[PDB]
From Swiss-Prot:
PROSITE patterns: GLYCOSYL_HYDROL_F22_1, GLYCOSYL_HYDROL_F22_2. Substrate binds at D101. Belongs to the glycosyl hydrolase 22 family. The gene is LYZ. It catalyses: Hydrolysis of (1->4)-beta-linkages between N-acetylmuramic acid and N-acetyl-D-glucosamine residues in a peptidoglycan and between N-acetyl-D-glucosamine residues in chitodextrins. PANTHER family: LYSOZYME C. InterPro entries: Glyco_hydro_22, Glyco_hydro_22_CS, Glyco_hydro_22_lys, Lysozyme-like_dom_sf. It is an enzyme of class 3 (hydrolase). Pfam families: Lys. It comes from the Eukaryota. It comes from Gallus gallus. This is Lysozyme C. It is found in: Secreted.
Length: 129
């Protein structure tokens, strides 16, 4: 699915992301826009043989297993193929583990460069929540 902005805000809030570990919903929506452009099937090559998968571009070196990334750790205990679904549950549950790892949403470089700092509440402006 390619979500709309408010549609994904509502879905993220139903899956418990609003204020998860203290990060308001607009952070998560901003991160999804600049990681995947709201597209649940997005994939991108990354370094060290890895790939980023899905709506929050979760990476295969540490978080999911894709069977093709040397050295990989699988800390979300999930195949990366399972993050390429129009249902956001697996990606939200893995995101909850990443953001709890000690460094919060800084794990997402696009969030760190294009969202953190900014008025992220604007990303849920006008949404029915």
């Amino acid at each position: 699915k390619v979500f709309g902005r408010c549609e994904l805000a509502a879905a993220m809030k139903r899956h418990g992301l609003d204020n998860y570990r203290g990060y308001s919903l607009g952070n998560w929506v901003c991160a999804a826009k600049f990681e995947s452009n709201f597209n649940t099937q997005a994939t991108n090559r990354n370094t060290a043989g890895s790939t980023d998968y899905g709506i929050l571009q979760i990476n295969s070196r540490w978080w999911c297993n894709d069977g093709r990334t040397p050295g990989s750790r699988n800390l979300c205990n999930i195949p990366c193929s399972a993050l390429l679904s129009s249902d956001i549950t697996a990606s939200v549950n893995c995101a909850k583990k990443i953001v709890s790892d000690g460094n919060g949403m800084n794990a997402w470089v696009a969030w760190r460069n294009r969202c953190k700092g900014t008025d992220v509440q604007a990303w849920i402006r006008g949404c029915r929540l």
